[PDB]
């Protein structure tokens, strides 16, 4: 389990909580969230997130990652337009705050 600010990720139960309340994430949104929080503040490229979270039938289409991050941000960020949990590293990828 991972606790970051007001966010808690429970891998064994596939649940994410914000202010202690279970969030309504798709399986893919949870796996993205968990994958990001599992690298713990290291930057992950879009291609890397595709290969691990989506898989082979998704090789070229990095835009799926950006679309899913935006949807995840709307669900977990206090201010989705100024995110604090899921962070962008310009031109390389995404990472979870330390
Ligand atoms: Zn990884």
* Backbone phi and psi for residue 54, each to the nearest 5 degrees, phi listed first: -100, -50
The structure tokens listed for 79 are 């201010």
- Alpha-carbon gap, residue 7 to 2, rounded angstroms: 8
Domain regions of the chain by residue span:
1-98
Give distance in angstroms: CA of 50 to centre of ligand 1: 10
Per-position b or e across 24-34, b if 16+ CB within 10 A of its CB: ebeeebbbbbb
Give distance in angstroms: CA of 52 to centre of ligand 1: 6
For 72-78, the CB contacts below 8 A with 24+ separation are 72/25, 72/29, 72/32, 72/33, 75/23, 75/24, 75/25, 75/29, 76/7, 76/16, 76/18, 76/23, 76/33
Strand-pairing partners, residue 22, are 17
Method of determination is: X-ray
From the options 3.90.1150.10, 1.10.10.10, 3.40.50.300, 3.40.30.10, give the CATH code of 1-98.
1.10.10.10
Whole-angstrom Cα Rg for the chain: 12
The structure tokens listed for 27 are 């399986």
Neighbours of ion ligand 1 (CB under 5 A): 52
């Amino acid at each position: 389990p991972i606790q970051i600010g007001d966010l808690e990720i429970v891998p064994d139960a596939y649940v994410a909580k914000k202010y202690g309340e279970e969030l309504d994430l798709t399986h893919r949104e949870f796996e993205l969230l968990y994958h990001l929080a599992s690298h713990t503040g290291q930057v992950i490229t879009r291609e890397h997130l595709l290969e691990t979270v989506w898989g082979y039938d998704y090789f070229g289409d990095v835009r799926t990652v950006d679309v899913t991050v935006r949807r995840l941000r709307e669900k977990i960020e206090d201010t989705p337009s100024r995110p604090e949990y899921i962070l962008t590293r310009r031109g390389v990828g995404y990472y979870m705050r330390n």
